[PDB]
């Protein structure tokens, strides 16, 4: 028999337009522009789920570096000293101690400095 | 010379910022009280400067 276009076409395009809500001007309005930008958004979103892991480790290291220097030590020497002392605390936890519990961070720094001397 | 790109809704709206009317110089007629253009004869009562003209 004859199968006319029906409603499938509209349904499919409406899904893309919903993904494009909040985009500027025609990019949330017109299907072709919206689909092109949703594709680019997907490309960015996948790439950025990898990049966010890089960015946060970059943030923690910088914060640990600032706290390390306040304890008479560079970031690189502190991580060497913690490794020598068998401390497995990760950079997310160290950065959190650097900001929220400075006394605990100082206790870790002292253990690292002790391990470096030995 | 022809438009290279169609003008967006936002850009068209911005251009029309200054495309508007103004209604300046209306004040009450001293004879009848209806609003009138200053320095013009009142179209309602036909007076001006306190006199029928």
């Amino acid at each position: 028999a004859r199968v006319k276009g029906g409603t499938v076409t509209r349904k499919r395009r409406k899904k893309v337009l919903k993904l494009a809500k909040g985009y500027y001007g025609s990019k949330h309005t017109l299907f072709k522009s919206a689909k092109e930008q949703v594709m680019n958004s997907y490309y960015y979103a996948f790439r950025d789920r990898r990049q966010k892991k890089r960015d946060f480790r970059k943030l923690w290291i910088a914060r640990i570096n600032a706290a390390a220097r306040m304890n008479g030590l560079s970031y690189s020497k502190l991580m060497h000293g913690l490794k020598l002392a068998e401390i497995d605390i990760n950079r997310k936890m160290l950065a959190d101690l650097a900001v929220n519990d400075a006394a605990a961070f100082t206790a870790l720094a002292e253990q690292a400095k002790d391990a470096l001397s030995k | 010379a022809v438009p290279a790109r169609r003008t967006s809704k936002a850009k068209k709206a911005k251009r029309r910022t200054h495309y508007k009317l103004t209604i300046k110089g209306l004040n009450a007629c001293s004879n009848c009280g209806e609003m009138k253009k200053s320095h013009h004869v009142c179209p309602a009562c036909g007076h001006y400067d306190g006199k029928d003209v």
Partner: protein, 101 residues
């Protein structure tokens, strides 16, 4: 008082009465869970593990198993008439911390 525990290939700060979300634990909902890899105990004083605090444990109860909101992986190459779409919902376990020993 708080502690840092090693769970799900990661480290989570923990306080009694707080709920954490971790990689799926193979323990039923409502059952007791014990973490035996504690690397730091904090609070008034601080205890540092080398790498684990000696004999410290963190006890909790699995409130619920669930799935995180769906994340889509859509791979395409411009001009190569080629795309791939994949959905994903990462399972998690929500654990209420009840005792830091």
């Amino acid at each position: 008082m708080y502690a840092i525990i090693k769970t799900g290939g990661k480290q989570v700060k923990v306080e009694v009465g707080q709920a954490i979300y971790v990689e799926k634990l193979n323990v039923e909902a409502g059952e007791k869970v014990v973490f035996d890899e504690v690397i730091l105990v904090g609070g008034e004083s601080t205890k540092v593990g080398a790498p684990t605090v000696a004999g410290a444990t963190v006890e909790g109860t699995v409130e619920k198993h669930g799935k995180q909101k769906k994340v889509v992986t859509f791979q395409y190459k411009p001009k190569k008439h080629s795309h791939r779409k994949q959905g994903h919902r990462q399972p998690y376990t929500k654990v209420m911390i009840e005792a830091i020993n």
